[PDB]
Amino acid sequence: NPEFFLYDIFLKFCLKYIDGEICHDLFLLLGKYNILPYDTSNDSIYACTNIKHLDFINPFGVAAGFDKNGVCIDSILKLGFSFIEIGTITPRGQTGNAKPRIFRDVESRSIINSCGFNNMGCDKVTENLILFRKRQEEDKLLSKHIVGVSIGKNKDTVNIVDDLKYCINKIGRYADYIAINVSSPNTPGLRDNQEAGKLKNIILSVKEEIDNLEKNNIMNDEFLWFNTTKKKPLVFVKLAPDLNQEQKKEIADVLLETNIDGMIISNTTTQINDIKSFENKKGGVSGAKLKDISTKFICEMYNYTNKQIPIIASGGIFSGLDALEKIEAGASVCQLYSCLVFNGMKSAVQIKRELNHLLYQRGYYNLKEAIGRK
Numbered sequence: 001n002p003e004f005f006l007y008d009i010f011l012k013f014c015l016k017y018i019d020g021e022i023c024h025d026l027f028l029l030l031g032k033y034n035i036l037p038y039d040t041s042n043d044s045i046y047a048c049t050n051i052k053h054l055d056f057i058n059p060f061g062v063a064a065g066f067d068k069n070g071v072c073i074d075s076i077l078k079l080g081f082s083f084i085e086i087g088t089i090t091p092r093g094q095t096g097n098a099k100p101r102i103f104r105d106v107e108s109r110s111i112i113n114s115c116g117f118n119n120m121g122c123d124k125v126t127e128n129l130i131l132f133r134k135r136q137e138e139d140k141l142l143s144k145h146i147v148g149v150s151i152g153k154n155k156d157t158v159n160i161v162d163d164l165k166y167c168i169n170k171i172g173r174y175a176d177y178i179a180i181n182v183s184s185p186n187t188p189g190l191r192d193n194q195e196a197g198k199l200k201n202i203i204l205s206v207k208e209e210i211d212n213l214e215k216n217n218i219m220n221d222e223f224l225w226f227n228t229t230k231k232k233p234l235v236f237v238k239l240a241p242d243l244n245q246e247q248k249k250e251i252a253d254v255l256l257e258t259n260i261d262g263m264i265i266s267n268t269t270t271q272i273n274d275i276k277s278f279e280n281k282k283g284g285v286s287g288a289k290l291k292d293i294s295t296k297f298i299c300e301m302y303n304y305t306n307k308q309i310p311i312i313a314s315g316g317i318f319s320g321l322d323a324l325e326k327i328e329a330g331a332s333v334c335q336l337y338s339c340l341v342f343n344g345m346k347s348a349v350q351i352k353r354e355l356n357h358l359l360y361q362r363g364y365y366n367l368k369e370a371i372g373r374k
C-alpha cells in the first residue's frame, strides 16, 4: 500500500537526522495510537512453524528489546509478524545507562547499544500485557498471535533467580513463553550466569515456578492462562555469541538435562571492531555484521544438542535469503530487530514474500522440511 510506502519515507528521513532511541520511542508511540499500517494478508500455510505445541502462523517475529515495556504490542504484530518478545523486563523499574546509548551505522546496517536494562518494571509491564490480552479477545487480527516475555534481573540484585521468580509470578499467566536471557553485555555479572552449574539452577527454578502457577490455582487451564496457548508458558533461553567451544558444549549439555523448550540464538556481540563510527562506543553490536557469527552459532548448538532442542534465530536477518540460512542451519523461527530500523514497516510483508518464493525455487514443500538441512 501507499500507507507503508509513505511511512517508510518518514522513517528513512528520521534515520538520517534524528537520534536512534528518540526515533524508536517516536514510532512506538505512533504504534501505541494505532496509526501504523496493517498486513491483513493471509499467510502461506506452507510457511507455518512450531516449537513443541507452540504454533506460529508465520516464521517471523520481533525480538526482545524492541518493545521492552509492551506498550506497542498490537500495532507491531499487525505489521505482519506472528509473534513478539517483550522485555527484557526486571522486577523493579530501571533507568538504564546514560544517553545516548544507542547508535546506528547505516552503510553497514548495524547497531550498537548499551541500554543496560531500561524498562518500566515487571509490575507495570504486566498491566500492559494484560490490557493487550483483553484487546486480543476482541481483535480479529490478533488471534493466534504469540507473545513471549523476556525476563532478567535488576542491576544490583545479588541473585538472578529471586528476580526471575518475581517476574514469573506476576506476568507468567499472560505469557505464551518465557525467555531467560543470561546473555547481555550491558550489566556486569549477568553473563557469568552462563556457567553450566548456575544455568542449570536457573533453568530448573524457572520451570518449577511456572509449574507452581498451575498447582496453586484451582481453576482449569481456560480460566488460568490468560494467554494465547491457554497453557503454561514454554521456557526458552537466549545465548550470547561470545563464548568458546567448551562453554557452548557445556551449556549444550545443560539444556538437554533440563529438557528446555527452545534456545534463542543469539544476542548481540562485543567482538566487532571493523565499524568506524562505533570505535568510540561500548555495548553489543547487532545487525548485518552479526549475521555470519550468529548463523555459525546455530549450527554449533544444533549439533551439540543433537537436534532435540528447537532453535529461534536472531542476528542480521534482513532478507528471505538470510532467513533461509537460519532455517537450514537449524532454526524453526526467526526474530527481526535491526531490519525494522533500516528497512522500515514493510519488513514483515517483504521478508515473508521473499521466503515463500525461495522455498518454492529451492523445491521445498513447506518450511518445516527445510529446518536443519545442513
Ligand SMILES: Cc1cc2nc3c(=O)[nH]c(=O)nc-3n(C[C@H](O)[C@H](O)[C@H](O)COP(=O)(O)O)c2cc1C
Pocket (backbone or CB within 6 Å): 063, 064, 065, 066, 068, 087, 088, 102, 111, 112, 113, 115, 150, 181, 238, 266, 267, 268, 286, 287, 288, 290, 314, 315, 316, 317, 335, 336, 337, 338, 339
Ligand atoms: C537497542 C537494543 C536493545 C536490545 N534489548 C534487548 C533486550 O532487552 N533483551 C534481549 O534479549 N535482547 C535485546 N536486544 C537484542 C535483540 O533482541 C537481538 O537479539 C539482536 O539485536 C540481534 O538482532 P538483529 O541482528 O536482527 O538486529 C537489543 C538490541 C538492541 C539493538
Ligand SMILES: Cc1cc(Nc2ccc(S(F)(F)(F)(F)F)cc2)n2nc(C(C)(F)F)nc2n1
Pocket (backbone or CB within 6 Å): 011, 012, 014, 015, 019, 020, 021, 022, 023, 024, 027, 028, 031, 036, 075, 076, 079, 102, 103, 104, 111, 340, 341, 344, 345
Ligand atoms: C528510523 C529509526 C527507527 C527505529 N526503530 C523502529 C522502526 C520502526 C518501528 S515500527 F515498529 F515503525 F512500526 F516499524 F514502529 C519501530 C521502531 N529505530 N530504532 C533505533 C535504535 C537502534 F536506536 F533503537 N533507531 C531507529 N531509527
Ligand SMILES: O=C(O)c1cc(=O)[nH]c(=O)[nH]1
Pocket (backbone or CB within 6 Å): 065, 088, 113, 114, 115, 116, 117, 118, 181, 183, 184, 185, 186, 187, 267, 268, 284
Ligand atoms: O537492554 C539491554 O541492555 C540489552 C539486552 C540484551 O540482551 N542485549 C543487548 O544488546 N542490550
